[PDB]
Design a protein around this ligand. Structure first.
Ligand SMILES: COCCn1c(NC[C@H](O)COc2ccc(CC#N)cc2)nc2ccc(Cl)cc21
Ligand SMILES: COCCn1c(NC[C@H](O)COc2ccc(CC#N)cc2)nc2ccc(Cl)cc21
Lengths: 203, 203
């Protein structure tokens, strides 16, 4: 049984890219969904016996796992179109650190530099739905995956704030944390090879 | 006088991209070159009076500067073609943390998570030349900008180790740290707009 973690930030397509290839080589494949904020926390619990985590979250070296880059995805800073920081930028981008942020919370209470909130006014939720609900209502601003805001952006229900910080969305590496034991196993190298070249095409 | 920091990791072309645009708007422009390992350390010294730093190094918020993304460049992990970790990977990638690393040193003695050495066996130098000299000689492995190893790679003088970690080179955001005062100044927004769309073309 190959246990596999995919965080909520990973487009649901890339999750079909993996399972397709994995099931070619492996006979039992378990797919677990975590918050980006809980991915590395989960694999660190030995009893969770995760073999592969696909997550946006970064840490220099986890005990017994190796890291590599599967590809890249795009986050966007979004708010209600009538948000103060909306319809403006550069001073707005800076002010994000003052206006209320709707942030992914974590069981560990802790965050990475990458995922920790930027604003001194933060309201925590558990997933990107509860985030973008409290954002459609103009309670604050949030940063969420492209695939979560594509629908609402063209609808005009949500507006982008991020473009002057990073045009075309904030590029974010997708990392593969794999059990060191998979290190010399064509099965896993087949997964990387395929999973990679397929997730280029989505991008 | 607009003082401008460009770290050694920034291709020398992108440094012509900036100066071209900047000199269109500004009448005195000073261009300082730093180690990536010394960029943010330098702008933090108030007396250094840096107005714009273009550097690969990341920190969540520097006092009085705002951050944004200019674009992306590619580092490669390189070694002597007869290096043990050479002509191999995945276990080799993991072993990088054991074999000797030739690392950029810093006046502050300190490094960011991004720039800190990965290996327990590290020999510090001051620039990418001294790095790739001690690497051509097989004293250790190093990670250097594409533009620094393009020549030597096709020559066969150096080999890439990084490809199974991140195919096509390890993508690295180029950051613009700009004095908050430039925040609402078409001059600076002109620089970003131009500098960005021009540095897409190099990539
Ligand atoms: C840099 O984001 C990529 C990683 N990432 C986060 N991180 C949440 C942190 O609280 C930082 O949020 C920031 C918001 C604004 C700026 C400037 C502008 N504009 C910088 C950082 N949340 C994410 C959600 C989804 C994805 Cl794919 C990546 C995410
Ligand atoms: C992740 O690198 C991008 C930032 N960056 C560094 N950082 C030097 C650190 O000691 C980490 O070196 C690593 C070497 C190997 C691996 C896995 C593989 N393969 C991961 C990290 N040095 C750089 C030099 C130039 C540029 Cl453009 C970026 C650099």
């Amino acid at each position: 049984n190959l246990r596999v973690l995919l965080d909520t930030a990973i487009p649901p397509s890339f999750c079909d890219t993996v399972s397709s290839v994995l099931l070619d080589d492996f006979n039992m494949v378990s797919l677990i969904r975590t918050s980006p904020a809980d991915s590395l926390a989960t694999i660190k619990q030995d009893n969770a016996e995760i073999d592969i985590a696909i997550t946006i979250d970064e840490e220099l070296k986890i005990s017994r796992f190796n890291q590599c880059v599967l590809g890249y995805t795009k986050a966007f800073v979004v708010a209600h179109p009538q948000h103060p920081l909306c319809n403006a930028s550069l001073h707005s981008i800076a002010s994000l650190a003052n206006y209320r942020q709707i942030s992914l919370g974590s069981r560990s209470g802790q965050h990475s530099n990458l995922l920790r909130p930027v604003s001194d006014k933060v309201l925590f939720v558990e997933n990107f739905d509860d985030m973008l609900r409290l954002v459609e209502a103009g309670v604050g601003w949030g940063i969420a995956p492209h695939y979560f805001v594509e629908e609402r952006l063209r609808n005009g229900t949500l507006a982008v704030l991020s473009e002057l910080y990073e045009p075309g969305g904030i590029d974010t590496k997708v990392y593969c944390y794999y059990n060191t034991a998979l290190e010399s196993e064509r099965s896993f190298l087949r997964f990387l090879e395929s999973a990679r070249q397929r997730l280029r095409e989505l991008g």
